[PDB]
């Protein structure tokens, strides 16, 4: 499953006549696009590789 979440504050005079606002006009925007399932599990780094990335000498 895929999740799209949006939050923000929008000035009411910036709304167009088709009741549509572009996202660049929204103040204090929060945009999230995440997923789950094994497709999302296949894009996470393993724990030993994460520790080797964080704690390598170089």
């Amino acid at each position: 499953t895929e999740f799209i979440r949006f939050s923000g504050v929008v000035n009411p005079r910036t709304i167009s006549g088709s009741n549509s606002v572009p996202s660049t006009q929204v103040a204090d925007a929060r945009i999230e696009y995440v997923g789950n399932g094994y497709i999302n599990e296949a894009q996470n780094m393993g724990w030993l590789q994460r520790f080797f990335l964080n704690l390598s000498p170089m």
């Binding site: 005079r13 709304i15 167009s16 006549g17």
Partner: protein, 54 residues
């Protein structure tokens, strides 16, 4: 009759006030909006304040 026609009182004075506005209801005698962009811009501002978003 003579003092009021020759002198003025201290602290009693007029001032000047200025503003910008629009005139509607003309019979085709308005300005060319293709050459004056401020007329269309302020009309859009007035409509957006009223609630119309062109």
């Amino acid at each position: 009759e003579r003092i009021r026609d020759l002198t003025s009182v201290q602290g009693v004075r007029e001032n000047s006030l200025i503003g910008y506005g629009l005139v509607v209801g003309l019979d085709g005698t308005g300005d060319q909006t293709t050459q004056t962009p401020f007329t269309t811009q302020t009309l859009n501002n007035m409509l957006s304040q009223l609630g119309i978003t062109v």
